[PDB]
Design a binder for this molecule. Sequence first.
Ligand SMILES: Cc1cc2nc3c(=O)[nH]c(=O)nc-3n(C[C@H](O)[C@H](O)[C@H](O)COP(=O)(O)OP(=O)(O)OC[C@H]3O[C@@H](n4cnc5c(N)ncnc54)[C@H](O)[C@@H]3O)c2cc1C
Ligand SMILES: Cc1cc2nc3c(=O)[nH]c(=O)nc-3n(C[C@H](O)[C@H](O)[C@H](O)COP(=O)(O)OP(=O)(O)OC[C@H]3O[C@@H](n4cnc5c(N)ncnc54)[C@H](O)[C@@H]3O)c2cc1C
Lengths: 448, 448
Amino acid sequence: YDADVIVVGAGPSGSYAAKLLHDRGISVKLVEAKDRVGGRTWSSKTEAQGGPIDFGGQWIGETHVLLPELGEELGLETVSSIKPGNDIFVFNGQVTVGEEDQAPASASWTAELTRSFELLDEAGARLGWEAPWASPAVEALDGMTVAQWLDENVSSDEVRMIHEVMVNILNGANTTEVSMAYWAYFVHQGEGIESLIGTRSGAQIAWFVGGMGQVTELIADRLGDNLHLNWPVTSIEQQDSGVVVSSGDRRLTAKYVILATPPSDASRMIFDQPLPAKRAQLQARAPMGRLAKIQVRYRDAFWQEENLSGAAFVCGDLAFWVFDGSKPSDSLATIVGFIGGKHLDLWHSFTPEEREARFIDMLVTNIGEKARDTVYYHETDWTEQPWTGGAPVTFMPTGLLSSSGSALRGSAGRIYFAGTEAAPMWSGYIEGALRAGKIAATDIIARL
Amino acid sequence: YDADVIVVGAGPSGSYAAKLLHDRGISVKLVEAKDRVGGRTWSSKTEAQGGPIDFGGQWIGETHVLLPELGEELGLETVSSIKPGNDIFVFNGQVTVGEEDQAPASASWTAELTRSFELLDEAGARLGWEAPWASPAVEALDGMTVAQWLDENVSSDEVRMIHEVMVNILNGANTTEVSMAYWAYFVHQGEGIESLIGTRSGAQIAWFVGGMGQVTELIADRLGDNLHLNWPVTSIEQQDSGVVVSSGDRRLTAKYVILATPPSDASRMIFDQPLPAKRAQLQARAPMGRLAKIQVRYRDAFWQEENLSGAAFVCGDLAFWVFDGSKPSDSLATIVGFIGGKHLDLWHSFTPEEREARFIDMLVTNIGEKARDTVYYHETDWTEQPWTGGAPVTFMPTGLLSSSGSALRGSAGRIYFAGTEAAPMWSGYIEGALRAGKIAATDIIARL
Ligand SMILES: Cc1cc2nc3c(=O)[nH]c(=O)nc-3n(C[C@H](O)[C@H](O)[C@H](O)COP(=O)(O)OP(=O)(O)OC[C@H]3O[C@@H](n4cnc5c(N)ncnc54)[C@H](O)[C@@H]3O)c2cc1C
Ligand SMILES: Cc1cc2nc3c(=O)[nH]c(=O)nc-3n(C[C@H](O)[C@H](O)[C@H](O)COP(=O)(O)OP(=O)(O)OC[C@H]3O[C@@H](n4cnc5c(N)ncnc54)[C@H](O)[C@@H]3O)c2cc1C
């Protein structure tokens, strides 16, 4: 054998699984398709004026345990993402100012928003994170779309617009595309909707100074020539005695394989023998969402003069989730905008010059005319990255979670499923990637 | 350049495009991932006792033009598939005998079945075959499943069960999985439901003696070393003056490429530069169905003694579409059964021996105790074939046809989309594969 274990994919999940194996002195190879590690995490200390920038995922949550622990182990510093001032809600170009991070008690829609979150959380609780595919509630929820559930359960146009931007960003998909069962499950296993839409709480509370890309890069440094970049896995062969992992004519042999890729990217690989039917259907039918991350930098955080946090739920035909991404040690202030799903479909119909003009028009509504005085502007389109299907997460259409969801976790013979989609909680997030890597590495260390 | 054109995929569509280019004197290479040509067509003259057998698609339709013309050009003989006698309808093990190929006027559900076919045909005509993604009716139908359409349009259990077997076989997918827009479009562009479910009419009227695999095999012979087998395309690079098609380290260069694969199988390839957004989303999100084709042979066609055609709609938890697949030149009689979608998910939970036992028990209901005296039994599971996503066809979940469906046809720069899914009519069928290949080859001939 070339190694005891081959890990396929050097995102946070595969990188962490390889780190845990290498730390125990188990022989491991980490193979990665791209010319870099990080997967959906990606940062540069030098490419953007004003300081490090994260092109992919960057927020650390308040309940995350493995991510801050690994940050400490790799010698990274965290900084708070929390901003003072009022968040805003924008509906078709019209601004409602929040009260800190709360919808204003005076708005007609605030009471129904709270009710709509309890309904969504209740649907999630009926499925659970442990075995949603086996829930007596899953058949009915998995035969309908989020759009259909919203038609049945939400009256207020404002409440419906907030739910639409949340799904189009948090799943990168239209409410007409995503199973309500998958959405309800996804939100519950992220500790509920208020957790995932936190602007200063829940999933969004901190950053690593120097960028999130450092997590995988500092692991790659520990692994040395056990990491192979530019090594796209084309086929995986299971034998009685081990596994053969191929990239074209290049072959590596091992006792076990950890597949640390999204199900949709695993579908590109040829398996002999064929994977279990539920897993093969999961890989073919659970696509990635679509998201773009747009970042603008300014000489200073001028919105703080108006007691604006910079955080905004921008709803309508071109919907965004907007944050202040500034670190105290940066040289410039940063606004980060996300656009996904059906809103990104419209964005894709525009020229690059039209997109930048529309983005800056949107910011002028949120933070005023100083938003035109940009020092830097950048878009990362996560539908155009090779061997990454999309962003931020995998989603499922009707019928899949209830028929095939159990194949998100565990193993098939000598192939162990990692990647964030395999995590029992925090699937979709870096914390889930680490949890899924830890489970696969832990189970293989017991088999060795 | 290695050739003017590289054609990717040696199913009927690619094979036919390569043939048309070669016949016009245009230099062409045909590259195929598998160790054989044919794709979803696949036959053997010698592997099965009693005569040639088709593991993949085999029926020729009464309106098909290119397919009978090509068979004639390649020197193949056609024979009628039409069988005399009564078809049957089976509901959870209870037989209703038809009147030839008709539901009996005396059955409580026959009038409702005819009404339901008119409602389905009327939904498809609102979308049309030319540009269903542009129909005013498409967004509403594309946001709901076939199962939800059935809940609104169909009352009787028997009628609902017939529609469920039709979708699970003709799209290889559950009614809760398939967009009603997609299904309605698919059926319309196949000349309507009665055309696609014909047992002795419409899409099912003839066969090629010797097997449908002979079409691609005889084209392969004509192409000689212009065909490369075991040549899975891993990347396609578009340049100013041509394209580079790669299989690992192996490279071919041409002026133009014909992609003659299903969208889902095209998603495996890495494109530099990235395809148009609609096309990239289509390839990622239009999966293939799941189908198995089960064939049993007997000393004679004993069901004819009971004035049974051998054709049956077997409905319920384990649903099949059954035919007499006997040719006069065969030395045994053949029964052919299809199982797909959610019925095939249940079948997959059984062992190979449980499946054979259950299939023979099912045939005993349809044609009596002599069905136990098998001479030959074979299953082709079209979810276990490398570089074919499934069978019989590509399907779409909610949201896709209305957002991205236009990307089924045409071209992106020097890359021309073929494969049956690109056909303006008879998409899903061999006739469609030939039509799409003809359109791609004709447009490239004009460009050169
Ligand atoms: C714009 C954006 C914003 C996000 N925001 C956050 C956030 O703030 N906080 C958070 O926690 N999460 C966030 N996420 C999600 C987070 O990035 C992912 O959950 C996490 O990266 C998943 O890690 P992973 O290792 O499971 O998969 P990935 O990061 O997707 O890594 C998979 C790896 O597998 C490789 N691979 C694929 N196919 C092959 C093959 N055939 N051979 C070999 N290698 C292959 C890929 O190239 C890739 O490197 C965000 C994502 C994006 C893109
Ligand atoms: C069980 C079954 C029953 C059917 N019944 C009928 C019927 O009776 N009549 C009928 O008209 N239709 C029928 N069909 C459908 C019919 O078989 C298909 O419509 C037809 O074969 C489509 O032809 P195609 O060339 O578009 O695609 P395919 O036949 O799918 O061929 C695509 C080819 O591309 C190759 N390929 C994929 N990826 C790559 C890559 N990366 N590099 C290189 N090559 C690649 C594949 O290996 C394959 O050979 C049936 C299908 C099945 C499976």
